[PDB]
Amino acid sequence: QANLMRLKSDLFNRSPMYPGPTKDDPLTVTLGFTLQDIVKVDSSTNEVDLVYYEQQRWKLNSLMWDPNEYGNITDFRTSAADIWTPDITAYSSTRPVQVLSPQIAVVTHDGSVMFIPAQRLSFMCDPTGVDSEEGVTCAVKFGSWVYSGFEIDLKTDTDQVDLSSYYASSKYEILSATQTRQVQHYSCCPEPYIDVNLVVKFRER
Amino acid sequence: QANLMRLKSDLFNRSPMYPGPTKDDPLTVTLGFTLQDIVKVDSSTNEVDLVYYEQQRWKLNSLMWDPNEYGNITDFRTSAADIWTPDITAYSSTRPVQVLSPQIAVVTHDGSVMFIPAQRLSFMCDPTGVDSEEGVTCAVKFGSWVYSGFEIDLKTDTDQVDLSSYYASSKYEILSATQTRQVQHYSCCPEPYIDVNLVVKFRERRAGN
Amino acid sequence: QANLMRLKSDLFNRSPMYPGPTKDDPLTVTLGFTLQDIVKVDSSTNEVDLVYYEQQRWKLNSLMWDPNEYGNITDFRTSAADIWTPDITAYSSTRPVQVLSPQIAVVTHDGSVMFIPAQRLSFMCDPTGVDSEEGVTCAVKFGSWVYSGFEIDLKTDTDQVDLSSYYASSKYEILSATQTRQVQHYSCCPEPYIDVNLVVKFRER
Amino acid sequence: QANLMRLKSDLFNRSPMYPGPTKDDPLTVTLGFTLQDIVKVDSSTNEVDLVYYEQQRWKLNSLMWDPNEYGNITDFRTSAADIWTPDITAYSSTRPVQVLSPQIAVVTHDGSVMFIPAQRLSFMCDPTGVDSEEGVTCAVKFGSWVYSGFEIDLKTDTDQVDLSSYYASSKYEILSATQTRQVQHYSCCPEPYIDVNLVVKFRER
Amino acid sequence: QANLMRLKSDLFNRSPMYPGPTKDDPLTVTLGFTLQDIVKVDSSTNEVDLVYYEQQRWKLNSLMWDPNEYGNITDFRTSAADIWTPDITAYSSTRPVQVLSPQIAVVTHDGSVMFIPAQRLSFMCDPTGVDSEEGVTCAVKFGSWVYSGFEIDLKTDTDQVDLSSYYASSKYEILSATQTRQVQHYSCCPEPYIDVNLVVKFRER
């Protein structure tokens, strides 16, 4: 306890909070999705509801420490309110995202952070034809809302969405699910924005 | 990090928060809408649900800095809780507005602020006739709830709503969408209030016009 | 900015918050309603939903200032969390009231406060017969929940509810709408309570 | 204002908050219900929704003062967040209770507190037969969640629920409504727990 | 009051908060479920809703005290916000868990904590066949979201779920209900995670 209390006090009480990335100190966030369930489709409003969790990884110099000076602590758990987290947002949501897990991240001595929130998302998707053999395809982009590619870049480790925890008795079966980096331009702003495009093809079981 | 931490500490820890605009220091907020989806209509209650984002821009002297004194930082991102934001309100809403994006603004060295919240709004609109070729027209006013035209004025850069991100498989297609400055008077108060009137003409998606 | 910052600092940082009215320093709150819409009726539960705004006015000595000493500032806007507000409550609500506007009041140099929240209220009302020519009448009382007439009195400026912003394409038309001061006695307490009774007569358009 | 500000500062800024009752300093809470409406029944889930208010009374030595020393103030209103309140809980609820009134209590110079929150509760009840002449009977227990009878005892002043504000045009009429002290034993714990059992018999009007 | 105020001040005002368990100071949490009601099933989305309470027990050295030094106080009640609590999470939920009881724990002089929150959970379950004699079986895992088996281990005192408070007029009757410790591995992480698997077999009454 003593060494960890001392480490946390040294990282968080002694400086002002990290103010987020900049053009001079940019950041790369690694994203990956694990799809648990397509819970429902609403064919009268063209909304689909997914339950998933989203692995987020990044690295800050200001969260580094030497394990020898703190009892060989190599990592610790801390509330996501104590640290900066990237503002990753679904670009075609129709309701606020619901949080289904504790908001706690793991920080490692090299300054790397892992944060894996479980979420339920309603987003824009036409499910017409879901009851056929071909199924339907829907897509949603995840990216920073306010940081361009000059401050936050994104990447994936794989283009395959993890389906190994997909609920076996869902109403819908997944035919494929990919996650792919893209670059976009928007009217407000001259700078390129990065997102990961989650594309899911599914049909009634 | 160091220069930005120092800049933020100088802007926010050294004074009391900006107390908002006044008759002597009025403010102009620029509004623009980007309509993403008409999600549903309820014909039994005359409520329609929109998903959009609303570009807000304004400028304060108290957020100015000289970039040379702070490592050539020209702008930064900060939580919308750290700064004053205008109290722009839909005047015919029937539910609290739902927030669909992080509440983070960008402040620039000249004191200008950009803030672009994504929202879902339920508002008063009669959708009778939406299933015809002509469609229906609905309107909603956005303005300050508590500041008159003497403290907050509004403008748009264009009268055309941005429809280039409108969801192509929505149940409803947009025939037109405008955003226009107006002046109103209300019973409580002799002072004029300014709003931007969002007028949308739409109909059910069909196979031909 | 400077003069207003100084005024606000003098009113709010230098004293403990106003502790509310008492038997020795009673308060009169003026109420007025502006009815925007009867949104729906539920005939299976006898609940009706109104959207309105409620003008509240009161006056405290502790919010007085001399304009000459503060750059001729005659009034200012401040968050409703910074000041005391009266605990005006609907007496036959069936759900928490939903807030549809910013919670910001205007304070004037004589100590007077204006606060005009927009609300959606579900309350107890039998809509049977709403589809006839005579329509139906419903009523809801608004008053302080915890202050009797000895600490908070209420009044209206007019007995006519403002209908000049009533939604012209509502499903329901208003035949009449009044707002009237009343005195009530309740089981808990010997002291009289004051309310304003909002009576609305309406029918299907 | 001055005397009340001074009294409140003396009661709340000068000590740590009251830490709640104990085996050595037990507390008796008096409960009484005023039933306003049975709003709806759901026969597919066996849930019923009540709107009521719950009178709570208790007495602490640490809230005593001498009126002579504070301008003859005999009582005052304060936010329920400023004082300890008993953790009275419905034992068969199916949703979080909704709060329908301001959370403000009245403290009297002898240390006695009155607190009367309005609530909407969904609880477990089979409404099958509600459309007959005999109606149905349902029951819900209210008591402390975490304090046994050794720290919190309950009582009522009467076994009759107050029905004098019951909504006259409710879908349901009340045939009877009682509130009765009981003792219960639970699996977790050898100590007796006290509750007040609210028993309501009703049918369709 | 005095001795308890002093004890609480000594435990909570004098140190930084306990930072949670680590590889060097691991923790065992004991879990047990008391099932109150299966409230509803949704056969169009494969979601089932349970109301239960979850007994949690653990022990920290930093919450120890000597009763002789504090008036023979052997335990006390405190808000769950004042102490660390384990991040026990349902692994197949489809909505945020609703809290149905006060969040108050009991701390004992040996450093042991008991915490028994009431909850409503929607989780993934196919109710097809619930209207037959055989019924249906559903399962949900509860465990730490962010701590592996190296920091948090779990156990049960019994494998039988407590059914002695199960609502007798529920739409569904319970045929069996077990709670069993398991070890799992997940894609993100090489370390084993521990859960308690709640398996319920039920049918229409």
Ligand SMILES: NC(=O)c1ccnc(-c2cc([C@H]3C[C@@H]4CC[C@H]3N4)cnc2F)c1
């Ligand atoms: N200099 C600036 O003020 C600036 C520069 C780059 N991005 C933004 C920005 C951008 C966005 C938009 C970009 C994407 C699409 C809509 C919204 N998310 C939102 N909020 C923002 F503040 C603002």
Ligand SMILES: NC(=O)c1ccnc(-c2cc([C@H]3C[C@@H]4CC[C@H]3N4)cnc2F)c1
């Ligand atoms: N000096 C004053 O007391 C004063 C002067 C101008 N406007 C307001 C005001 C006005 C409003 C209304 C104006 C529009 C229509 C309803 C609401 N928004 C709300 N809150 C307000 F405080 C108050």
Ligand SMILES: NC(=O)c1ccnc(-c2cc([C@H]3C[C@@H]4CC[C@H]3N4)cnc2F)c1
């Ligand atoms: N001396 C006292 O303790 C006292 C004197 C006057 N009114 C209240 C009171 C009254 C109320 C009720 C009175 C009306 C009807 C229900 C609720 N509003 C609620 N909370 C209250 F505290 C308490």
Ligand SMILES: NC(=O)c1ccnc(-c2cc([C@H]3C[C@@H]4CC[C@H]3N4)cnc2F)c1
């Ligand atoms: N010494 C102890 O640890 C102890 C002694 C007595 N009651 C509880 C307790 C009891 C309860 C249960 C008692 C009733 C039934 C379920 C829940 N409310 C909840 N929270 C609790 F902490 C704990």
Ligand SMILES: NC(=O)c1ccnc(-c2cc([C@H]3C[C@@H]4CC[C@H]3N4)cnc2F)c1
């Ligand atoms: N060294 C690390 O960064 C580390 C080590 C072990 N577990 C996690 C972790 C793990 C999880 C997942 C593990 C299980 C399955 C999904 C979620 N709960 C969530 N958040 C986490 F932080 C992180």
Ligand SMILES: *[C@@H]1O[C@H](CO)[C@@H](O)[C@H](O)[C@H]1NC(C)=O
């Ligand atoms: C690192 O590990 C060893 C125990 O294996 C021990 O010397 C010491 O606890 C650690 N280093 C410190 C405290 O500096």
Ligand SMILES: *[C@@H]1O[C@H](CO)[C@@H](O)[C@H](O)[C@H]1NC(C)=O
């Ligand atoms: C700021 O710009 C000037 C040149 O205009 C130069 O001194 C330097 O490269 C910049 N400073 C930093 C800290 O980037």
Ligand SMILES: *[C@@H]1O[C@H](CO)[C@@H](O)[C@H](O)[C@H]1NC(C)=O
């Ligand atoms: C305030 O009012 C007086 C007029 O009575 C004037 O002389 C003074 O300059 C004014 N100050 C302002 C507007 O700042």
Ligand SMILES: *[C@@H]1O[C@H](CO)[C@@H](O)[C@H](O)[C@H]1NC(C)=O
């Ligand atoms: C309190 O009552 C007594 C009269 O019996 C009086 O001496 C005292 O001044 C009173 N205080 C007031 C009214 O503030």
Ligand SMILES: *[C@@H]1O[C@H](CO)[C@@H](O)[C@H](O)[C@H]1NC(C)=O
């Ligand atoms: C503490 O010890 C016992 C209870 O086990 C009690 O009889 C005694 O009065 C207490 N003494 C003090 C000093 O509190």
